[PDB]
Amino acid sequence: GLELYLDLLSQPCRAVYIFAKKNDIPFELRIVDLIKGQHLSDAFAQVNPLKKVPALKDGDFTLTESVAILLYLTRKYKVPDYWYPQDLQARARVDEYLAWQHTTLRRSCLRALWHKVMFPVFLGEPVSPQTLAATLAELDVTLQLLEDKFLQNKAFLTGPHISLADLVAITELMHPVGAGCQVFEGRPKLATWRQRVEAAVGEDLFQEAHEVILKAKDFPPADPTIKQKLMPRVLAMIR
Amino acid sequence: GLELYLDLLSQPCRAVYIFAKKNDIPFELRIVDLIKGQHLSDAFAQVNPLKKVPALKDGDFTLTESVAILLYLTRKYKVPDYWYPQDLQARARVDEYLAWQHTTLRRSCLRALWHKVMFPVFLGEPVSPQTLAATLAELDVTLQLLEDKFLQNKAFLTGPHISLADLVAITELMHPVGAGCQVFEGRPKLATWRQRVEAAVGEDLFQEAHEVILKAKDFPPADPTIKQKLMPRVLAMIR
Ligand SMILES: CCCCCCSC[C@H](NC(=O)CC[C@H]([NH3+])C(=O)O)C(=O)NCC(=O)O
């Protein structure tokens, strides 16, 4: 009874989805449709009281946080070593990235998607161009840190092989890709890394997991009641 | 040997300090004085190019991020396993808290200190009552989530014993305590939990680690050159 409560629109759900499918981990997929406000229902509030996705249920055990969910599945299903290496220092490099991204690249990628596309297209709320400029400037800074602090001259973020870190980072970078931002343009080292990550994960799986975010621009505007319920949740999300 | 680059004024450094000292981990303490902008010096930039503390140095290996540092020390020095339990679901509970706090409690506790004390006292910069109110209301939301999602009816955040999760949370909560917020007042579940954490950590060590944050209201204001150097760093920290 392993169940993953996911919406492929969100960066953390894509990381969990790709991981579980790549490693042939059997699970029931429960799609929690975020644009319909399904995560705000009483039925989802029973699974996760915080009313957020991804959420994991394994028997009677409930787990939140994509980093925790990824580590739980890594250990329980005994996946290959490269995802979270046995080696003390390689493991630490994975921990370093997973910790760093929460307050930096996660935030920057999220704010890029919402200020450029999901506020004016989906919630019908225009964003000032000064706010959008500042957001994309901050995106540039985090992308530069991704290159200079993590990737540097290596094949992958923490070493010669893909790890949990590369999975979290690539699903994050696809948020502004879906928003139409020039993420990999003029960043050749990131561009070749993306292609290496796509191959390690499986290109077909990569494409499949990113079908929803790549069409975020074509979302019909929200329902006036749905917009009302989602607005404080989104404002607390974007900070 | 092992070197820990710390400033006990900051929440993540206190967590690392308390962990290394409680577990009798031999290290060389390198105080990096934030108030004097020592983290911005060319000498510290060699240790950590990101110019932030805590930073670990163990020979040719350098590590950032307090969560990564705590886990690396956990593993290398074979500390008691209650800090990071071997049981999969208990270890997940620790991972769940460590992941959650980065964008919620860490952020509120850091903003409480800066908007209530460190901007007006140390940097001579007034904060609007509206900004401070917003910050302290968000702190109350995170304190309620700490109680309702994590601590609940248990002795500690993840079960019957202390873990790395309690260490991160207690050092976070002492940031608004040092700013003069009535954190444990009217929250009896948190107040008794604090007493259990202090008892488990050892009261003398707990007090030693918190000597600087409890004196933050009395820091002499920065001169105009130090202020000018620290202001863009502080604004990137306080978004
Ligand atoms: C139509 C879009 C609705 C809102 C945007 C969804 S972004 C995804 C977001 N997920 C989280 O905030 C959990 C983050 C957590 N740190 C993790 O990694 O698991 C969520 O479900 N948040 C939902 C919410 O807070 O309302």
Ligand SMILES: CCCCCCSC[C@H](NC(=O)CC[C@H]([NH3+])C(=O)O)C(=O)NCC(=O)O
């Ligand atoms: C009085 C100076 C103001 C410093 C405020 C915060 S001190 C803590 C801060 N450290 C971090 O941002 C690292 C956080 C990281 N997520 C961790 O847990 O280690 C820092 O060294 N920041 C220094 C900087 O960014 O300049």
